[PDB]
Each structure stands twice: as C-alpha cells, then as structure tokens.
Design a protein around this ligand. Structure first.
Ligand code: CA
Length: 320
C-alpha cells in the first residue's frame, strides 16, 4: 500500500461485450486489476452492465451505467468519477460523459471501436446471407441465453443482435453523429481530436491506447497474411496456455483482409484513436489489454496491469 494510484475521484471500470457480468460469474473481467489498484490506494468500482445490448436507448448499457455512476457517487460521497472502459465499454463511457458531463472528470478508452469493427461487419454480412433469415433468430436465442446465464446478476436484458449492430462500422458513424466529442477527429481521417473537452463549465480529460499485436505482412493472390507480434514465433507458450491468443490472430487475419490494417484482433488502430492517444504500439491482442485469459500474454507483450496502474497515477498528477 501507498497512494500511488489514489485519485481524487473514484475510478469506475467499464466492460465491453460478453455476459451481463461486471466480473465474476465465472472469472473476473478485469483480471487482477482491481486488487492491484486498491493495493496502491485507489477507490475502484467495477460496473456490471448487460453483456449484449446497444449503448444508447432506454434499455441500453448507457442508461445502466448512468444509474450506476449515481449509485457510486451517493455511496462514496464523491462528486465526479473517472471512467475507464475497454472495448464497447469506451462507447458506454462516452454516453455518460455526453449525457451527464457534470458527473465525469475523465474518460479513458482502451481498445475501443469508436469507428466500429470490420470484424463486426463481417459477422453481420454472414448472418444476412441466409435467404430464409432463420439463422439470425436462432443464434440470437443462443447468445441471449448465454448472456443471462453468464451474467452475475443473471440479467435478462440481453439483445445479441443490437450489440452486433452497434459494433458495426456504419452504425458507429451514426453513433458519433448523435454523441459527438471533441476527442474525435474527422471520420475517415485515422486521426485523433483534442485532449480535453469542455462541456460548459465542466472540463473532461480524454485518453486512449490501442493494442496492435496483429500486423499485416504480405499480400499474394489477393489475400494478405498477418503476424502476431505479441508472441515469439511458433514456440510461445501463450499459444498453448491461452486459447484466445490464436483465436484473435485468426479474427485479426479476417480484419486485415477487410482493409483494417494493424489491429488487436477486433479493433483497428484507426478506430481506437481518441483524445490524447498515449500509445498504439502495445503488442497486445484485444484480451491482453485487460490481462486475459488469467493473466497469460505473449513474450513480447507489455504488462497491462503496470500500464493501467501508471495511468491511475497520471490522473492523480493531473488533478482528477
Ligand atoms: Ca492473453
């Protein structure tokens, strides 16, 4: 213990897809990160939202988080919170920052698809290929039951198709239209915006970082091969001990063929840019960003727990 990560305002960790579980259910989402932060003097809360849903909407994750923030403020006696989200959680965070600017002090997005995911476009295109349209109903029924069963609170508010639609490239562009941010650059620019945003009296510190383990190598006959820079070639134990390692290399290959460029298996570099970009050089796949699975990472991957801890100190020195 010490006060290295002792920020003025409480930190709320915001999850992306999968299960309406903040963590727990069958394993914590932010693996070992809450314990580490607490040990260094931080007040941390983990949001428990719908794993499958859109961010906006009456029953979306955005309104669920707003409610949660209010509960935390009432409990801690604090006046604002620092929001840090991974994946879709970064989009849920932007919603609260937009809808309730006076209750937010900073927004940090880790591997967030601000411009959507090319892999999402792929999955939906596949689903839409069924001329009878029956598959979409069955897979939705299957993913929804999964969500409620994996949910810690066994939340019945799941909508697999809404969540899929949300991570889509086209839908993201509409989201950015409805919930603009000074941290965002022009669409199609692959550029970031300003490091802060002042929503009338309230100023927000904006940060982001991406993982770019999946790099495009060569193209031949149309296809482009990719490389997983987070692992030592072939022999890396991560390939054996963490099944998401190879899985994300594969989804990352599909993305490279959809013109995404370097990515983390789900989100590309350009789609993740927001506010003050601390780095896009991390050799991490989408799940390494949150120290998964069970803390397993490739030999070339930076320590995610260390980066997040260092960031809580960054906020502290910034005054939030
Ligand atoms: Ca991993």
């Amino acid at each position: 213990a010490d006060n290295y990560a002792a920020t003025r305002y409480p930190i709320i960790l915001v999850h992306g897809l999968t299960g309406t579980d903040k963590y727990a259910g069958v394993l914590e989402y932010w693996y070992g990160i809450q314990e580490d932060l607490q040990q260094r003097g931080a007040t941390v809360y983990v949001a428990n939202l719908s794993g499958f849903q859109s961010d906006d909407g009456p029953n979306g994750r955005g309104e669920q988080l707003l409610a949660y923030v209010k509960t935390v403020l009432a409990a801690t006696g604090a006046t604002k919170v620092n929001l840090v989200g991974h994946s879709q959680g970064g989009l849920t965070s932007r919603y609260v920052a937009a809808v309730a600017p006076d209750l937010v002090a900073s927004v940090t997005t880790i591997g967030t698809p601000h411009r959507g995911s090319e892999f999402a476009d792929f999955v939906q295109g596949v689903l839409a290929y069924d001329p009878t349209g029956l598959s979409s109903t069955v897979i939705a029924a299957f993913v929804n039951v999964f969500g409620i069963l994996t949910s810690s609170s066994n939340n019945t508010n799941q909508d697999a198709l809404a969540a899929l639609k949300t991570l889509t490239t086209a839908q993201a562009a509409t989201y950015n239209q409805n919930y603009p941010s000074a941290g965002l650059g022009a669409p199609g620019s692959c550029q970031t915006g300003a490091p802060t945003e002042t929503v009338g009296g309230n100023t927000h510190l904006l940060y982001s970082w991406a993982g770019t383990a999946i790099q495009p190598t060569i193209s031949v006959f149309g296809v482009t091969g990719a490389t997983d820079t987070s692992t030592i070639p072939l022999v890396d134990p991560a390939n054996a001990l963490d099944p998401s390692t190879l899985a994300l290399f594969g989804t990352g290959t599909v993305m490279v063929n959809r013109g995404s460029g370097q990515n983390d298996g789900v989100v590309s570099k350009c789609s993740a840019l927001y506010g003050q970009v601390l780095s896009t050089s991390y050799k991490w796949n989408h799940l390494d960003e949150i120290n998964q699975l069970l803390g397993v990472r490739g030999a070339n991957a930076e320590d995610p727990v260390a980066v997040i801890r260092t960031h809580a100190n960054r906020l502290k020195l910034a005054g939030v």
